[PDB]
Design a protein around this ligand. Structure first.
Ligand SMILES: [Zn+2]
Ligand SMILES: [Zn+2]
Length: 397
């Protein structure tokens, strides 16, 4: 039940030192410290030599931010653990999550504090018992941080944090871990190491199973008879960006939705790009003007996904709000729990962004455009996500 990660990394822990923690229980800080010590002892290359080594730093945040120690301060696990033990919580009267994230981006990973080595994965583990209520706006700071190639894991403790805020901050919604008490932190260790050791890269030549789940309502071609073809061209252009299709590379499937959902083709129907693109083009729209986003996702879950070890992706496109036959929140949750990464795109003024946000793996994976002609504007960003390939590297000690 104890694991390790052999990945070379610079790891920053963002450690809430708000007064709420001390008020709740005088032993809470010790339990937080112990948890962080256990993290240190989970990374095998911490304390290694020179260029094959991992580093650890800790930054306290509540009212303002204090660096407990930088990445380059200590050189062995023991010394790092002593550093953690010697930390003095400040018991601030505010919780500035965003200011913490900003400090980490601007200082913690800088050359001056020992960061910047390109062979190293950058990881931030945030621990908080509160909601951000002052300082730099957190969603924006989290965006800039992650844009620099930083993985963000968020741990929420007790009843005072808000889960959707942590979900916006973390790399994906399932990089958020929650527990009811500081006493149970240790039950999250394996999960945190598993996420920290998840290596995600952009690789359009990898093995992936990709499902387009798209709107085929009569509404699409209402204000412009080109819309449906523009949407097909967008999907065909995405297919063309993969190096190789079929069982030896990338497999594609299509599900469409209107009042209900229909599997047009599964992952094993076609192996050539020409066949995949021609199959996309043959798909006909419904004469019904409903959009069953929930049914589309259910269909992908039950009829498309059940290749093993391969990255699974759903790219969903809609021009309307859900009809309620199935719950998009529930169906997407089930898909994401199975390892499916979900990208959500709304086109026009008929969709609801809340629903896109509910189904996507992250609000960073949500895209909106005013028209089908402007799908080209989001193409590059969508491809980078469609090509994302995540590999778990943690294993038992
Ligand atoms: Zn190992
Ligand atoms: Zn607090």
């Amino acid at each position: 039940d104890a694991e390790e990660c052999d990945v070379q990394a610079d790891i920053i822990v963002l450690f809430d030192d708000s007064s709420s923690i001390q008020y709740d229980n005088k032993e809470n800080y010790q339990m937080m410290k112990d948890f962080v010590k256990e993290l240190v002892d989970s990374f095998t290359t911490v304390g290694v030599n020179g260029r094959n080594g991992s580093q650890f730093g800790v930054v306290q945040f509540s009212q303002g931010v204090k660096t407990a120690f930088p990445l380059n301060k200590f050189k062995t696990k023991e010394d790092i653990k002593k550093g953690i033990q010697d930390m003095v919580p400040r018991n601030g009267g505010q919780t500035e999550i965003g200011t913490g994230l900003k400090h980490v981006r601007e200082n913690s990973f800088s050359g001056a504090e020992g960061g910047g080595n390109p062979d190293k994965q950058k990881i931030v583990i945030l621990m908080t018992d509160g909601k951000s209520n002052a300082g730099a706006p957190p969603q924006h700071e989290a965006h800039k941080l992650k844009a620099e190639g930083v993985t963000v894991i968020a741990i929420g403790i007790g009843q005072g944090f808000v889960k959707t805020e942590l979900e916006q901050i973390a790399t994906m919604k399932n990089y958020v871990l929650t527990t009811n008490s500081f006493s149970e932190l240790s039950t999250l260790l394996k999960l945190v190491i598993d996420l920290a050791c998840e290596v995600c890269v952009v690789d359009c030549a990898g093995h992936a199973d990709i499902a387009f789940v798209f709107d085929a309502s009569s509404s699409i071609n209402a204000n412009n008879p080109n819309n449906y073809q523009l949407m097909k061209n967008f999907m065909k252009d995405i297919v063309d960006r993969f190096n190789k299709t079929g069982p030896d590379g990338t497999q594609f499937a299509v599900v469409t939705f209107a009042d209900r959902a229909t599997k047009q083709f599964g992952l094993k129907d076609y192996s050539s790009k020409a066949d995949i693109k021609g199959a996309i083009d043959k798909v006909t729209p419904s004469i019904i003007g409903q959009t069953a986003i929930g049914d589309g996702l259910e269909n992908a879950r039950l009829e498309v996904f059940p290749r093993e070890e391969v990255q699974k992706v759903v790219i969903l496109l809609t021009d309307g709000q859900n009809n309620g036959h199935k719950s998009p929140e529930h169906e997407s949750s089930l898909l994401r729990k199975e390892g499916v990464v979900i990208v959500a795109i709304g086109v026009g003024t008929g969709f609801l962004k809340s629903e896109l946000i509910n189904i996507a793996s992250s609000e960073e994976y949500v895209f909106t455009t005013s028209s089908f002609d402007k799908l080209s504007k989001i193409m590059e960003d969508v491809v980078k996500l469609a090509c994302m390939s995540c590999k778990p590297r943690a294993h038992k000690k």
